Structures are given as structure tokens and as C-alpha cells.
Design a protein around this ligand. Structure first.
Ligand SMILES: *[C@@H]1O[C@H](CO)[C@@H](O)[C@H](O)[C@H]1NC(C)=O
Ligand SMILES: *[C@@H]1O[C@H](CO)[C@@H](O)[C@H](O)[C@H]1NC(C)=O
Ligand SMILES: *[C@@H]1O[C@H](CO)[C@@H](O)[C@H](O)[C@H]1NC(C)=O
Ligand SMILES: *[C@@H]1O[C@H](CO)[C@@H](O)[C@H](O)[C@H]1NC(C)=O
Ligand SMILES: *[C@@H]1O[C@H](CO)[C@@H](O)[C@H](O)[C@H]1NC(C)=O
Ligand SMILES: *[C@@H]1O[C@H](CO)[C@@H](O)[C@H](O)[C@H]1NC(C)=O
Lengths: 150, 332, 55, 111, 240
């Protein structure tokens, strides 16, 4: 529709071909100040394509939903509530070699009380002790009045 | 080094001393992504400000009580809902919008594994203009919304000011003027009215509804912006051609420097204009997200005496359901 | 461009310690033009001849 | 031209204006009577290394002495190191803009 | 009296606040001490303050570096371009450099206007909080503080304002039997004002929404109704 080439047809063998752009993307590499190696991650790719098109495997690796991650053992069952190297779709990597884990910023407060009503009564955790806490907030109201001459 | 110029040596060599004009572009783009994921994290934080769920909560088993249908507002099964991510209502919303997070990752994944070239995402992603997935997947936000909706009805109540859903609608409708003498004797009518409202809302997306109009408008606007940005590379910009191979092959490598300087600064200023417009649009999105969070913690979780804010008319309740690149509200 | 590192060859002579290495030359065609440069040391001191003479 | 008898880096010597593009370089043989002397003297260890248009991250001390330098192209580690102008960059994800893809050359288009 | 009256809106009665005023005083003192000593670490307030200051400094530095850029010319200094080149043939060559600097300045002032408009909107929100949560208080949820907000002091900050959102956070909870809604056998309902109904030794008592304190049933904590519903705990001898 735009006007770019997408295929052609040879005039000597009467063969038709569909032109598909080849891989020219990037690669994500997570680094930690306390680490030494790097957690290379190829977004939207397969491990077979990377091995057959870049080099041979030399570091431990495993497949993932985002792509083929290198030098990072995957552990989906583990969950962390605070991560500094976010990769996307709730996946994080951190130095223990890095480990591919999942991260959830906030979890609900589960309780061991019943859901239904027995005898017409329910179960709710109400407080008994309280401490007034103090929060902070800064709202940018004024800005430096910059001036430039002609 | 991808959208500015292709994978060549002449373009990259000139971008060494002149590369300082793209560092601000990369920094402002990183700032844009910072505003985006920080607002997403703030939305995820405000959707669960005071939730308190139960450990023995079977979402797949116990999901309907007090004559009101909540099947479309529950989307998890078992202890860990890995196979099931979204609910039924979210599935109906995401069925018509295939350019979601899962849709984007599926289109980007099925680019080299073998398919037919019928989309522009492969040519967009191979020219440096890619769309990274958000830090929080749509499944996580859908689970957060499901947890909030379930906590609003099952004890302990969090998004209903500590009162059941039926008692919440009965006490809220009293503020409009009708007494409880009629509401107490017509609870079944309110239950069937809510069920009919949910059915009409679910079946309303088949027509030219306003929700799908703006959702598809946002998705189409982003796709159109990316397509227009990619078409800028094909622009002549006063040069003989647009392809880098032609300009670096037909012309001499010594006399084409001053000729390619105007083309490269034209592409750089086009990128600067695009990132400036992107920053303005992202700031508008941030303001819209602020209004969305205000409605979430002002009309969904609780209710205050405000007129024509949570609904154009006599507002009663306002449910929340995840939508592609935004949120959806049910202003009852 | 090039990068060359030289390791000192501490050769001992009778009651004297000297150190001499090879001679480096640069050029394009090595004729009476192109501004050939020859750099050669003479027992601790470098001598450079930037003249384009023949060889 | 740059030479340094002591220390790891090298200092400036001179600069001229030739104009003619240089293309070769050679090592003059030595018609020397005493080079090895039956494996009793130091032999020749002359080494050369080609250069290319690259960029580094030179760290200067309080006295202006180079101590550490980042290659910026040896691996992804050097790219992340010189991306934030620090030998030990902060934590987080680093999208390496300019990843090597090693493409093929395309010339002589036919009508 | 302001903190005592405002804390009643969350659910806790004055029977506990009146006897524990010293606890509120020491809690406020400890809160102020924690806020004052919180700037030494990587607090969020200094993070955004230094981010704004460094953003303005970075913008000015980037603008100054725009003068040092070549812009396709032979050099960036004015003396070199007006001294090495002739004063007659350098006009068309300097025209592109001067219009490049003018368009760079135009882009900078456009971004400055956009940023200042955002600053104006933020100032509007700041003024709204000043005259909405600091001076007075209105029934708004999760606006003046992420949680049970009570008070909000104001203090000047470098290029902006600083607020002390004094929230209300509990420590320990307690399992108990609650029962929202109740009704007398004489076909008349009872609704809790702010709290729930808890049975305690064959007696119905009402407690707050944020503090377990069984107090007797009165008229200031009961929302009268006309008829009882169906899913209400039927219990007589609860006449008022
Ligand atoms: C290719 O197709 C053309 C079109 O009909 C036909 O004339 C020709 O014989 C075919 N084969 C070759 C080898 O050109
Ligand atoms: C890094 O290692 C040092 C070694 O003592 C330790 O003090 C520091 O806490 C570590 N930091 C992280 C983020 O692991
Ligand atoms: C890595 O992920 C796969 C699923 O993609 C999973 O089957 C496998 O067990 C994981 N490896 C671990 C947990 O070591
Ligand atoms: C409530 O908790 C605080 C926390 O230090 C404690 O000092 C106080 O004694 C507690 N209240 C009671 C009644 O024990
Ligand atoms: C270069 O100079 C030498 C001087 O020894 C001379 O013999 C030779 O003819 C010159 N070359 C040409 C091409 O004249
Ligand atoms: C609540 O109401 C529903 C429908 O009116 C009824 O089936 C259910 O039994 C009631 N709950 C109790 C505890 O009686």
C-alpha cells in the first residue's frame, strides 16, 4: 500500500519470490554494579536462530517468553516484590550469574478467614493499635526563570 | 544507528563527532519511557491501595452470589492462574483489538519463524522503530483489576467502603432521592437490572460503540505515527534518492559528504520533532492517567458528593475492567 | 593506521651497554614523491628523514 | 607520531601536512654481524597492529595520567561501560543501540 | 481539636482519643523527627527536587553545547569563521549556521513553554491541595494522602512546595465476628453509620471501621430505615 518492494519474479526461470526483511534488531543486556558478567537477552527471537546465526553457545541459557536470554538461569516460580532491572511483561533479572525471575510490584493481603457468612455473620480484620505516620510529597510550583538574548 | 542510518560504515563514521546531537534524543526517549512505566506502576499501586483478599478464595468455583452475575469480572482459576490470564469481559474487549501486548509480541515473534508478509510491524521493527512491551503485562493488570472487583464484594470489602455490593447500591441509590421502602421490596428487580446492564454492555461492542472507537483511534494513531515516521526515511529531502546504498554508491565518497550532511540533519530534526510530539502526547496521557486514577479511587472504591463526574446523570456505581492501553469503566 | 610497540634489546658489549632495534619506514609508492618517512635510531637517539628521496 | 620510553600511554611528537594517502610500511632488514650469536643475545621482537576509527572512555587521574580505558566495541560490557561514562555503571536495563548485525554488501543494481 | 475531630471521620471514636492525647502528641513529634531525618537517605522528595534542578541545569548545558556544535560548518567559534574566511563569500555560508541556531532556540523555547505549562498545571494541583487539604478538609478518598489521611502541613521547598501528608496506619489487627446491617422484629431496619455490628456475649454492639472498640448502640451511629431487608440478622430486644 505504501509503495515499497515486497517481492519479484525471475524472467529466466519463471519463479516467484516473496521478500521478507531479515533480522537487524537489537539485544538487551542487563548489568549490575556488583556483578561481572552480562545477562544478554534477544527480544522476540528463538535460541536456534541465534545459535545458527551469531555463534555457538558458551554460557548457560534457556528459552523464555520474551526471547532467548543468555547467561541467566530461568526461574519463573520465584517472585520478587522489588526489582531494579525490569525487562518487561513482569520479568526481572538480578545477580545472586544472573537469574531470570518474575516480579510483582504489589501483592494482595491474603487472610485465613472464611468468605461466606456462617450464622449471618462475617469475618473482618479490624485494627486495635494505631501509629500516625508521615508521608512526603513535593509538587513543582516554581521553575527557574531562564532568559536568552538576541 | 538504526533509524538514523542503515547498517553501513560511511553513515556510522560521520556519526562519531556528530553523535552528540542524538544523545539528547535517546535521553528524552528514556525519560518518556520512565514517565510511562512510573505512571503504570502508580496505577497498579492505586488499584490496590487497601485490598485484603482471602487465602481460601476459589475464583473459578465461588464467583456468583446475591443474584448478581460476576462471571465476566473473574479471570483466574486454581492457586496459580497461569493458563487463564484475563476474564470473559476482557476477552471480549481484547478480541476486537488484536494490537495489544500479546498481539505485539506475537507479531514480533512470528517474523522470522515462517509466515506471510502482510503487516508493517516487521518492516517497522527492523528499522529501529520497535515497541517494547510494558513492564507490567496485560495479564498482571487484569489480575489486579479482578482482585479489586472480587474484593469489592467478597469479605473483607475494600473497594466498597466496607459494605456488600447489594448494600452499597441500596445505600447509594438513597442519595438520589428514592427511599429504601421501595428498594427493599424490589431487590430482585435491581439484580435483574444489573444483569441486563452487564449483558447490554457486553453486547454493545459489536456495533459502533464509543469505547471501541477511541480504543481503535489510539491504536490507529500510534500505528499511523510510526508509519509516518518510517515514511520520513523514504523522503527525498531535496536529495537525488532516499536509499543509502544509492547515495553512497553512485556518488563519490569524497564529494558526497556535504550533500549527505543536509539529509542527515534533516532526518535528525525530523526525529527531534517526533520525540517532541511524543513527549507532549505522553504528558497528555499522564494527565489522562491522573484523571483515571482519580476516578478509580473516587468513584469505584468509594463515593463522594460530586455531580456529573462519575456519570452523566444520576450515578450509582462504577465498575472497573482492564482495556487495551487504558482502562474501562461501567458508569451505572 | 598502525600501532607498534618495541621491547628494549639490552645487548652487552665490552664494558658498554647499548640497545638498538630495527628501522621503520612508511610510504605509499616509494619513488621520488609521496613524502616517504624513514625513522631510524643511532645508539640511543632517533633520526628521522622525511625526505622523499629514492631508495 | 607518538613515542614513549617510560609509562603505558604515549605523548605527542609532531604533525605535518602531506596530502598524499599513505598505503604501505616496511621493516628494514639488519645486515648486522651480531644479532643472536649462537642464542646468546637478544633477538628481534618487532610487532605491528592495525588501527580503525573507534572510540574509548579515557579516565584521567588527578595528575592527568591515563589509568583505565574502555574499548566500547570488544563486547557488550564495554558498550554499557562507556555508555554512561563510568567504569562501573549503575544497575538497570541497557538497550545497546548499534548492535553488530554483520550484513552483506549490495551493489550494481540491474534494470 | 482539629486532629481529634478529623480522626473521627475514619471510624475511631473519641473515647480512645480523649484518654490518649499524649500518644498523639508523641506520635506527631516522632513523625516530624522521622521526616526531618528522612532527607539523609535516598528519599523521594530530594530525588525529584534534585531531578528538577539537574534537569534545568542539563537543559541549559545542552543549550550551551548547541553553540559549540559544527552544524555542518568548518568550525563553531565566530572568530575563526569571520577571520579565516573572506567577509564577502562567508555570508551564504554563515546564513545556514545562523538559521540553525535560531531554529534550535525556537525548539528550546517551545519545549520551555510546554514545560512551563506543565509546571502551571502542577501549581494548580498544588494550590488545590493547599486550599483543599491544608486549610480545610473535604470527604475525598486517596487525594490528600495514600491511605487514611488526617492532616497535611505545608513547608516551603526549593522551586516548589513540600507537604506533610500525616496519614493513619494501624499496627495490629484482631479477628472478630461482624454483621453489616440488622433489624428489629417490628419490621424496621438498622444500618451502621461508620463501622460494623459485632455480637458480644448475647449483646449487639457497634465498633468503628478502624479501631476495635465495642460501644453501646446510640442514635449518632445508626442510620434508621423503614423496613427490614431479607439478608439481615433478625434479633429482637435491640430497641433504642
Ligand atoms: C514463462 O512464462 C511465459 C509467459 O507465458 C512463457 O511464455 C514462457 O514460456 C515461460 N517460461 C520461460 C522459461 O520463460
Ligand atoms: C555489593 O558488595 C558489597 C561488598 O561488601 C556490599 O557491601 C554491597 O552491599 C553489595 N551491593 C549489592 C547491591 O549487592
Ligand atoms: C524455564 O522456562 C520453561 C518455560 O518456558 C520451564 O519449563 C522451565 O522449567 C524453566 N527452567 C527452570 C525453572 O529451570
Ligand atoms: C500500641 O503500639 C505502640 C507501639 O510502640 C505501643 O507503644 C503501645 O503500648 C501500644 N498500645 C497499647 C495499648 O499497648
Ligand atoms: C628519481 O630520482 C633518481 C635519483 O637517484 C633518478 O635516478 C630517477 O630517474 C628519478 N625517477 C624518475 C622517474 O625520473
Ligand atoms: C442472601 O440472599 C440470597 C438471595 O436473596 C439467599 O439465597 C441467601 O440465602 C441469603 N443469605 C443468607 C445467609 O440467608
Amino acid at each position: 500500500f505504501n509503495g515499497n518492494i515486497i517481492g519479484f519474479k525471475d524472467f529466466v526461470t519463471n519463479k516467484t519470490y516473496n521478500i521478507f526483511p531479515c533480522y537487524a534488531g537489537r539485544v538487551s543486556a542487563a548489568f549490575h554494579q556488583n556483578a561481572s558478567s552480562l545477562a544478554l537477552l534477544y527480544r522476540n527471537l528463538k535460541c536456534s536462530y541465534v545459535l545458527n546465526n551469531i555463534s555457538l553457545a558458551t554460557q548457560p541459557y534457556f528459552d523464555s517468553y520474551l526471547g532467548c536470554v543468555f547467561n541467566a538461569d530461568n526461574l519463573t516460580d520465584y517472585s520478587v516484590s522489588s526489582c531494579a532491572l525490569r525487562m518487561g511483561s513482569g520479568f526481572c533479572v538480578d545477580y545472586n550469574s544472573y537469574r531470570f525471575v518474575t516480579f510483582e510490584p504489589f501483592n494482595v493481603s491474603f487472610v485465613n478467614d472464611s468468605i461466606e457468612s456462617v450464622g449471618g455473620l462475617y469475618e473482618i480484620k479490624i485494627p486495635t493499635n494505631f501509629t500516625i505516620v508521615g508521608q512526603e510529597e513535593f509538587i513543582q510550583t516554581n521553575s527557574p526563570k531562564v532568559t536568552i538574548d538576541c | 544507528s538504526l533509524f538514523v542510518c542503515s547498517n553501513y560504515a560511511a553513515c556510522h563514521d560521520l556519526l562519531s563527532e556528530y553523535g552528540t546531537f542524538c544523545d539528547n534524543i535517546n535521553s528524552i526517549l528514556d525519560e518518556v519511557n520512565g514517565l510511562l512505566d512510573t505512571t503504570q506502576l502508580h496505577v497498579a499501586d492505586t488499584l490496590m491501595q487497601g485490598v485484603t483478599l482471602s487465602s481460601n478464595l476459589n475464583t473459578n468455583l465461588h464467583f456468583d452470589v446475591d443474584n448478581i452475575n460476576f462471571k465476566s469480572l473473574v479471570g483466574c482459576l486454581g492457586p496459580h492462574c497461569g493458563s487463564s490470564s484475563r476474564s470473559f469481559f476482557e476477552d471480549l474487549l481484547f478480541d476486537k483489538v488484536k494490537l495489544s501486548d500479546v498481539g505485539f509480541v506475537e507479531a514480533y515473534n512470528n517474523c522470522t519463524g515462517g509466515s506471510e508478509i502482510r503487516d508493517l510491524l516487521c518492516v517497522q521493527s527492523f528499522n529501529g522503530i520497535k515497541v517494547l512491551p510494558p513492564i507490567l503485562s496485560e495479564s498482571q493488570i487484569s489480575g489486579y483489576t479482578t482482585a479489586a472487583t472480587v474484593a469489592a464484594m467478597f469479605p473483607p470489602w475494600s473497594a466498597a467502603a466496607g459494605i456488600p455490593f447489594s448494600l452499597n447500591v441500596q445505600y447509594r441509590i438513597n442519595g438520589l432521592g428514592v427511599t429504601m421502602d421501595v428498594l427493599n421490596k424490589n431487590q430482585k428487580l435491581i439484580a435483574t437490572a444489573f444483569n441486563n446492564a452487564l449483558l447490554s454492555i457486553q453486547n454493545g461492542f459489536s456495533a459502533t460503540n464509543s469505547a471501541l472507537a477511541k480504543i481503535q483511534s489510539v491504536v490507529n494513531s500510534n500505528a499511523q505515527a510510526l508509519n509516518s515516521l518510517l515514511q520520513q526515511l523514504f523522503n527525498k529531502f531535496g536529495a537525488i534518492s532516499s536509499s543509502l546504498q544509492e547515495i553512497l554508491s553512485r556518488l563519490d565518497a569524497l564529494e558526497a559528504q556535504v550533500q549527505i550532511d543536509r539529509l542527515i540533519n534533516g532526518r535528525l530534526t525530523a526525529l527531534n520533532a517526533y520525540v517532541s510530539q511524543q513527549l507532549s502526547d505522553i504528558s497528555l496521557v499522564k494527565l489522562g492517567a491522573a484523571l483515571a486514577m482519580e476516578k478509580v479511587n473516587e468513584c469505584v472504591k468509594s463515593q463522594s458528593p460530586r455531580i456529573n463526574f462519575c456519570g452523566n446523570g444520576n450515578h450509582i456505581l462504577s465498575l472497573v475492567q482492564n482495556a487495551p492501553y487504558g482502562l474501562l469503566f461501567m458508569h451505572f | 593506521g598502525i600501532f607498534s610497540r618495541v621491547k628494549n634489546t639490552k645487548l652487552y658489549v665490552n664494558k658498554t651497554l647499548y640497545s638498538e632495534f630495527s628501522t621503520i619506514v612508511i610510504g605509499s609508492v616509494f619513488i621520488n614523491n609521496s613524502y616517504t618517512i624513514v625513522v631510524q635510531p643511532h645508539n640511543g637517539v632517533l633520526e628521522i628523514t622525511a625526505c622523499q628521496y629514492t631508495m | 607520531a607518538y613515542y614513549a620510553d617510560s609509562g603505558m600511554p604515549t605523548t605527542f611528537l609532531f604533525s605535518l601536512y602531506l596530502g598524499t594517502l599513505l598505503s604501505h610500511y616496511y621493516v628494514l632488514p639488519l645486515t648486522c654481524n651480531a644479532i643472536s650469536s649462537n642464542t646468546d643475545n637478544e633477538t628481534l621482537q618487532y610487532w605491528v597492529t592495525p588501527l580503525s576509527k573507534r572510540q574509548y572512555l579515557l579516565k584521567f587521574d588527578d595528575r592527568g595520567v591515563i589509568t583505565n580505558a574502555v574499548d566500547c566495541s570488544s563486547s557488550f560490557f564495554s558498550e554499557i561501560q562507556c555508555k554512561t561514562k563510568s567504569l562501573l555503571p549503575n544497575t538497570g536495563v541497557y538497550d545497546l543501540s548499534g548492535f553488530t548485525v554483520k550484513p552483506v554488501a549490495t551493489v550494481h543494481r540491474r534494470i | 481539636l482539629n486532629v481529634q475531630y478529623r480522626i473521627n471521620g475514619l471510624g475511631v471514636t473519641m473515647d480512645v482519643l480523649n484518654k490518649n492525647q499524649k500518644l498523639i502528641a508523641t506520635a506527631f513529634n516522632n513523625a516530624l523527627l522521622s521526616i526531618q531525618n528522612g532527607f539523609s537517605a535516598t528519599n523521594s522528595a530530594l530525588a525529584k527536587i534534585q531531578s528538577v534542578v539537574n534537569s534545568n541545569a542539563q537543559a541549559l548545558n545542552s543549550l550551551l553545547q548547541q553553540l559549540f556544535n559544527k552544524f555542518g560548518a568548518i568550525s563553531s567559534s565566530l572568530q575563526e569563521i569571520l577571520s579565516r574566511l573572506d567577509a564577502l563569500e562567508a555570508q551564504v555560508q554563515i546564513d545556514r549556521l545562523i538559521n540553525g541556531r535560531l531554529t534550535a532556540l525556537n525548539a528550546y523555547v517551545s519545549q520551555q513553554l510546554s514545560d512551563i505549562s506543565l509546571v502551571k498545571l502542577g501549581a494548580a494541583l498544588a494550590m488545590e491541595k493547599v486550599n483543599e487539604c491544608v486549610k480545610s478538609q473535604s470527604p475525598r478518598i486517596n487525594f490528600c494522602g495514600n491511605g487514611n489521611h488526617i492532616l497535611s502541613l505545608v513547608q516551603n521547598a526549593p522551586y516548589g512546595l513540600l507537604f506533610m501528608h500525616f496519614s493513619y496506619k494501624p499496627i495490629s489487627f484482631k479477628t472478630v465476628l461482624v454483621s453489616p446491617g440488622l433489624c428489629i422484629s417490628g419490621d424496621v431496619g438498622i444500618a451502621p453509620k461508620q463501622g460494623y455490628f459485632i455480637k458480644h456475649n448475647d449483646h449487639w454492639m457497634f465498633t468503628g471501621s478502624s479501631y476495635y472498640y465495642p460501644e453501646p448502640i446510640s442514635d449518632k451511629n445508626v442510620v434508621f430505615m423503614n423496613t427490614c431487608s431479607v439478608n439481615f440478622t433478625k434479633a429482637p430486644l435491640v430497641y433504642l
